[model samples]
Target chain A: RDPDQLYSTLKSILQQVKSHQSAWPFMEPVKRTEAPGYYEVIRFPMDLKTMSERLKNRYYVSKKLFMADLQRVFTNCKEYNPPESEYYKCANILEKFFFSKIKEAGLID
Target chain B: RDPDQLYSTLKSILQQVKSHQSAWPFMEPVKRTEAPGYYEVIRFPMDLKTMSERLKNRYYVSKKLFMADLQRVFTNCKEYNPPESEYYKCANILEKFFFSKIKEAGLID
Candidate 1:
């Protein structure tokens, strides 16, 4: 996809992901006060809001960059929260939803 | 306890609660964007930060008021998050710790 096409494609994917029921936890950055040691554990923080901002700013020059950050949202959530935690559960569910959407869009095989 | 003693006692209690490992989730209010429909379900938003501010401003004239607000933090968390969620678990743990502290201080039996 070209730059414009990639941007639109990624934006639509993001919108779908954000609307998912499991996306609540990853809607915004984990606050330092809300989760102590979160920053220390997760070096790269990613969330739907940040991805939307990046998409608007054309920071995602390629679909791969957008995909990587989207994956980071789930990865970071899983890493920070316990496996049994709701946050971790959300991450797992949302990740599957995201991949399915991308695959259907032909962004990935 | 007199007003002075009550204030001092509650301040000490608030500090202790804030330092608890499970208190992270209650340290700040739930963000509107982060948790959709959170405010709608939880009309009275309470947290450690707000409780601390209330203590500092002498908004809590009695220990009962302080205790009530503290309990509200746990109640709010449990109400907003799922019973199996880390947030709900934290609320349970922190509530027990808070009650024990109050009992030891003779604030409650």
Candidate 2:
């Protein structure tokens, strides 16, 4: 089944509440580790000036998402690797989480 | 004149000091603007795992550098543009600045 469909079904089955009191009582907030940033190699066709601004913008956003993901991995997973694929997956989850938050705020389509 | 040669000559002219009392009184630290980060499109040949780790690292370090550079631009420059060329130049200056600091600390040969 499509992940969206599954999510919709699951959400439909649950009672809507202003807050997750029961869940909140059992769950602790996750904390992330501090990490360093690296250089991004830009390619042609993308203007260097625009790319630079974008890069800086990305650096900030990515760091926040990365931290969240790092926290999630440590809290939930058995082991974590600081490689590209793993980080990308973590970033993806972070993006999805943010997207849902934006949707909840009625700021996105 | 070669920039390297110019730097070497300039360095030789200045006497080494552990603290900069004279310059300290004349200087103020620059502040940076906070901004959001973006997604990086990855390419082939680079494994996703390694790339992810690097991206996370870059995100953290870049935030600090971006913040410093942001403050510097606002304080020193009459006008600033966040175009590719401008950012690249800023990053270059930052890299060079870090490089010199590293060399001074004997971290690199």
Q: Alpha carbon lDDT of residue B105, candidate 2?
A: 43
Minimum summed lDDT over a 10-residue window in model 1 chain B is located at B75-84
Interface C-alpha RMSD, model 1 = 16.5
Could you say which candidate leads in lDDT?
Answer: 1
Candidate 1: pairs in clash? none
lDDT of 1 by residue, B1-109 (tens): 5789988888888899999999998888778888987776566789999888888898999766886688668656754565667887787677667766776787742
Candidates in order have lDDT scores of 0.76, 0.28
lDDT of 2 by residue, B1-109 (tens): 4544434432332212112232221123222332122111111112123323433354323323322332232212211222233532443233234334434544222
Could you tell me the TM-score of candidate 2?
0.19
Task: State, as a TM-score between 0 and 1, how close model 1 is to the true structure.
Answer: 0.50
**Model 2: CAPRI class:** incorrect
Q: What is residue B41's positional error in candidate 2, in angstroms?
A: 20
Cα interface RMSD of each candidate: 16.5, 16.3
